[PDB]
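Supplementary Methods S3. Input chains for the assembly prediction are listed below.
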Amino acid sequence: SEGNEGVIINNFYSNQYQNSIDLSANATGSDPPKTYGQFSNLLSGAVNAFSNMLPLLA
Amino acid sequence: SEGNEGVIINNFYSNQYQNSIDLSANATGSDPPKTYGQFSNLLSGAVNAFSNMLPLLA
Amino acid sequence: SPIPVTIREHAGTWYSTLPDSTVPIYGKTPVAPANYMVGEYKDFLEIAQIPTFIGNKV
Amino acid sequence: SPIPVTIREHAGTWYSTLPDSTVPIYGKTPVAPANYMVGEYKDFLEIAQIPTFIGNKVPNAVPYIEASNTAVKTQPLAVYQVTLSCSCLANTFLAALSRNFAQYRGSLVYTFVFTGTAMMKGKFLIAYTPPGAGKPTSRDQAMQATYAIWDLGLNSSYSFTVPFISPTHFRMVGTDQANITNVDGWVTVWQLTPLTYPPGCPTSAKILTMVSAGKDFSLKMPISPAPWSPQ
Amino acid sequence: SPIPVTIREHAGTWYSTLPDSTVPIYGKTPVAPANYMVGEYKDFLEIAQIPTFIGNKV
Amino acid sequence: ENLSDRVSQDTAGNTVTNTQSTVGRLVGYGTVHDGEHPASCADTASEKILAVERYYTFKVNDWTSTQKPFEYIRIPLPHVLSGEDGGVFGATLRRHYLVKTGWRVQVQCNASQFHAGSLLVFMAPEYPTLDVFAMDNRWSKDNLPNGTRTQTNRKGPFAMDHQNFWQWTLYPHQFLNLRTNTTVDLEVPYVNIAPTSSWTQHASWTLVIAVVAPLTYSTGASTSLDITASIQPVRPVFNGLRHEVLSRQ
Amino acid sequence: GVENAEKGVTENTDATADFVAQPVYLPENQTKVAFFYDRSSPIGAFAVKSGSLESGFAPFSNKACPNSVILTPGPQFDPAYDQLRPQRLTEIWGNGNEETSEVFPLKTKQDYSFCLFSPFVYYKCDLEVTLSPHTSGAHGLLVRWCPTGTPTKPTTQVLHEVSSLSEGRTPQVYSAGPGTSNQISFVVPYNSPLSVLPAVWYNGHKRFDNTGDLGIAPNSDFGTLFFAGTKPDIKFTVYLRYKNMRVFCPRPTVFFPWPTSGDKIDMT
Amino acid sequence: GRTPQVYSAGPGTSNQISFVVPYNSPLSVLPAVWYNGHKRFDNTGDLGIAPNSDF
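Predicted structure tokens for the full assembly:
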């Protein structure tokens, strides 16, 4: 059930603050999101296709 | 994300007061409004057309 | 615009059994999933029904 | 019409971490546009993934280990304890980041960059041993745990991930006292085959060692480490 | 039914620039119509545009 | 020898760089200098001068067997190119109050398949340089990692010019590993405390070259490896035209 | 996983790449930057001079417990001019200045925690300030806050018998009564003329003269605070809280000493 | 530091302090009376309390 609290008013602090956050873990693991934000260093020119090419060795 | 604030209530002070105002400047400049208010001194009779005219030199 | 309040005579008291919560100081804390857990009960009446031993010849 | 209030016992306290704001005294202040700015991040996890250098031979730390022309199964090239407190990790961003939190979870990534000659050849056995039976004492015992064989060739580095193997969902970041024979196990590096080379080439090479968080890695509950002075 | 409040640490301070009003003590006072008035401005920028004299040979 | 999807060229005006062993161009912060006007200037900028958008190539120093780990050389920007070696770039730069630019660099160093060692090349905003913003003269391990404190500040924990080199890879970088490459290519966008820079008193970016795995080789192998660099201002935009700085030095 | 770190970028994995494993992700939000700095930390202890409530202000310090404070997480003070207006410094001063001296407690004023961990080159934020008197008895405190780059010499008393701090239209705050909680709290906006602030170092001079002294960028703080009050014997702590923090360009943090001891650390 | 600190001290306070802390043990659930295990894998035998099982 619930405890000993019987106030009519909506809790002034939201729940994620008033209480701990119950989480549940699934047995088989979970995939991290793909990206944690948009910060990134980028590697360009990695590959090919296009230059002063095919004078270039085989 | 956000910080460490988790109050349900609407901020009592409005934002322009609770926070700084993020503004953004465009590269190419911005035109001042045309007028800053309605205070003004006025120049009248600047030009012509109409009097005891054309007895008046050419 | 500040709101007028009347302070009750009992201002400042602490009630060991108050039906209410206090100030949260470390919000947004996720917990360690405990979802594999078994054997929980919620009411003492749930187990008061299990017989235990009466002491004879005290 | 004035509203009646009941004053709580905690009247007047200040909470350093209160989830709330205070009184604004200088409103309607516009800021200087900072919209040309780049490089912003928003979560530490965003950069905890970038590898930084592990210190070898402390306190005469060097960012690398040395491979030789001899494979002694009895001699690890390195042995790291898997603790975000290892003096080994003390100056990696991972460790510097982590020291501001109470617990971690997820994958740790040890990256090795071979820096020897192109003419050299060799194979390493990198193993992760969970706790319980002490640290392995020969490559033969390490080989009984999680391990990978790294072959030298065209590709310069090797990224070894130590899997999060733990009874609890999370692990404590820092040690209170020192953690024994504990900690969470060990990463040991061994030679499988010796570094081989042709005539005219040095007979040992340096292997750069770095550490980073895996995509799995998480940290929780911000605190402050014990204060220190770098000097 | 009296409402429970948490008193903030800054209780009792006075802020010279508070974005708020205080207690009115003499309400419902009508003013003397000043609607014949002219020359009002509302923003300093409205008059900062009028040239004044630079001092030479200070 | 060097190959295929590793053979790469970069044309800048009348300038072109070629490498036969690249590992790609690291673009820091994942963006390039857009060449956009600073929104803090009412004057129209002089931009797109072809004579300025090219590669300036000069020598950094010599890599030897003697360098120890983490010894480095700093190249302050735009300062290094503000002189005579800066061509029309320098000449234009000395007559403007403000400059807004990105950088595109290539650092070069060859050895052989019988040499061992690796450099760390990185670019960093607000990296602490010499007072006078000049390229370091010799390799040093000077004031690492706690910064430079005052003589008397006997017990001070550290100074604000601290640099924990164990973490230098947080900066946009690439390794020049002798077994792998001969060149390193980096590019950084414009970043600063303000929309454009009064370059005169601020070297906002520094190109840093550091040893991380010391040079090793057997006898008869080349003994000193020169280190050179090609630097190009990326879409520099100038504002506040006046007379010449002059003492350019 | 085989890789090539020379590119300057390394592919991230989980145990899943090389072994038979599963990803073990679980969500948390305490690692966001804003959340992390949105908590109060102290920058030092300050003092008020006797009878400042009714006279001209003048720089002064009690035990290297001054009179005014620059709102900044960086070092400031310089114990050698404890009687001069404080200034921002480029180094932290130990407790003593000779061998036999001690590093803690530091003499300068700074957010040691921020200093110890700020992996970014630039930042922007609003500043929440808390003044806490070290006394549970009545305490009167007058505060004057001046935006960065404005007049900071609140030296002329213009009104007979009124503190010179208490002059003008510059924000002034005052708490003093028998029923107060003694502490003061408020948040100030971001007033640097700069777009973003240097967090550690700024590689440039103060004038175009290049009268060489690098380190700090001018007007890169949140302003100055001046204090006057009634308990010249009670000191108070000043705390900073970064409201809506934004950081740009990761960079290295402060060096941590090699345990010329174990293979792990601890605490203290 | 940034570790939670609370402070009450003024002539108009009610002197008492109140607050609620979250659940921070790395453990899923806490032993209420006894925990039949040691502190290290060394079995440097001392049963009773499970490590980090407090608030």
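DSSP finds two helices and ten strands in chain G. The CA atoms of residues 259 and 266 of chain G lie 10 Å apart.
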